[PDB]
Amino acid sequence: FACKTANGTAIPIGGGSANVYVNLAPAVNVGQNLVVDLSTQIFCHNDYPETITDYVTLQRGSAYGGVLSSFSGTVKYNGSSYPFPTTSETPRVVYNSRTDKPWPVALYLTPVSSAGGVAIKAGSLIAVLILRQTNNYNSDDFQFVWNIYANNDVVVPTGGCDVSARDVTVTLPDYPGSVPIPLTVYCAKSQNLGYYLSGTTADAGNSIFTNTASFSPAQGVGVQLTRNGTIIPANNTVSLGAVGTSAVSLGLTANYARTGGQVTAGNVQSIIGVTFVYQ
């Protein structure tokens, strides 16, 4: 039993814990969210196929680590699903050939939000997997640890729904122009969704986000969002109806709006949050 990652990097086998860096592409699925499919990331083989067969299981106590430590879900191991953190030893995967074969493991998370996410930066711990290796000819029985680290920055969805982008930047035309905000949401199965805006506002209507531009800021103006011509105040939930597997636009447009006193020339910036809720 000897393994390497997708880019060909050796994983030292057994003895001390190994830190294994993998690419992940998290996604919402029906009833659970993929955190990482390791079957595309870890490939193993047997250097003595003619005479030895290797067996590898995933042991009890395997679990998420780091920022995912508090979450639970499932592990798909060799085509079957089990609770994660693991509460029993899985059946084995067999390695006989010198030809590489995937380690057939994918880790899933039980949704707890509507469209939330947890950022995982490259270099961060994802999971701690405990493996047990045996064979078909002697008593060798050894357990060892693979600490799975992110090779790339991702956001793990924690809900039933996911968004086109977690961070969106738009540029208005020169005042008094407006611009659509490209932002959509979809769900793994149909869900009834709403959303609301968060941020600091400047007006009696709680609907003009303050201009927080750092350099040479304009005075007397802020940013106001509309949907089909209707102003959306902060912290007032908008309904999206039922959102299925195809993306549904939030329908947002950005505008400038006056906050009082004279409008003066300069830069404008507003940072506005969007939060989804089930309805």
Binding site: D167, T169, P173, A265, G266, V268, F276
Partner: peptide, 13 residues
């Protein structure tokens, strides 16, 4: 929040 929108603009005289 779930998404952060950064809106940039400019007032020109």
């Amino acid at each position: 929040a779930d998404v952060t929108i950064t809106v940039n603009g400019k007032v020109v005289a």
